[PDB]
Amino acid sequence: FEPQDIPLDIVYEDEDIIIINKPRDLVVHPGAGNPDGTVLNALLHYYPPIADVPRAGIVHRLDKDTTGLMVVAKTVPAQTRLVESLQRREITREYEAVAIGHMTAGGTVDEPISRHPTKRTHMAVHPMGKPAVTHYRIMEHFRVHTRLRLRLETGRTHQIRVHMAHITHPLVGDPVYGGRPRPPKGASEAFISTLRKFDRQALHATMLRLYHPISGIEMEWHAPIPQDMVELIEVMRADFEEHKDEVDWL
């Protein structure tokens, strides 16, 4: 794998780790169909000595069109310690999302994931698959959508997107898992347009918390909700406010 000139948004860097804020349209690791143009290529360009760290220090990933935080190891001791912390469920990886459907409670989805039996670029829940756990809470209700905050225990392929689709609440804009139903009845022109143009899963890695792999000091980072999701949330919020105004008066 070769260095490529792909700018990264570095949130924090010290001797041992890098925190990045990943944009959409950026694959983390080379794969079938994506031989290059990845975060790994970008890291090798930014800090060539990282080639001496397993997988260029990449210890966890996000979907191509999921935005937000990743932690990357710069050194061998940092990489080993981060992997161990992940194995021990000692790193918080928190996500903001907008899901389709009104939802009434938070919860946990503890369901294993496999490749879909006929569609090879899709994953699926399956009893015999790779164990996976996602926790979710409701941040804000909308009319026929819900703003969620999610935390991972595991990081299986398409895990959040698959788990939310499994419970009948796929993420808005998800091009694979059913994120583009007809807009809500009575939606404003602005709401219809924003939904039409929102063409990725509404998923963002919003917060990381961990014990620093070398110093042991507890640290936390944030990535602001990207503008696309800000616009989406604000229009859904305005729509729900209009709805409340129609029904909350006796």
UniProtKB/Swiss-Prot annotation:
It comes from Escherichia coli (strain K12). Belongs to the pseudouridine synthase RluA family. The active site is at 63. GO terms for cellular component: cytosol. It catalyses: uridine(1911/1915/1917) in 23S rRNA = pseudouridine(1911/1915/1917) in 23S rRNA. Responsible for synthesis of pseudouridine from uracil at positions 1911, 1915 and 1917 in 23S ribosomal RNA. Other positions are not modified. Uridine isomerization occurs as a late step during the assembly of the large ribosomal subunit. Member of a network of 50S ribosomal subunit biogenesis factors (ObgE, RluD, RsfS and DarP(YjgA)) which assembles along the 30S-50S interface, allowing 23S rRNA modification and preventing incorrect 23S rRNA structures from forming. Disruption phenotype: Severe growth inhibition, makes only very small colonies. No longer synthesizes pseudouridine at positions 199, 1915 and 1917 in 23S rRNA. In this strain a miniTn10(cam) insertion has occurred; the first 196 residues are present followed by 12 extra residues before a premature stop codon. Its EC number is 5.4.99.23. GO terms for biological process: enzyme-directed rRNA pseudouridine synthesis; ribosomal large subunit assembly. This is Ribosomal large subunit pseudouridine synthase D. The chain holds residues 77 to 326 of 326 of the full protein. Keywords: Cytoplasm, Isomerase, Ribosome biogenesis, RNA-binding, rRNA processing, rRNA-binding. It is found in: Cytoplasm.
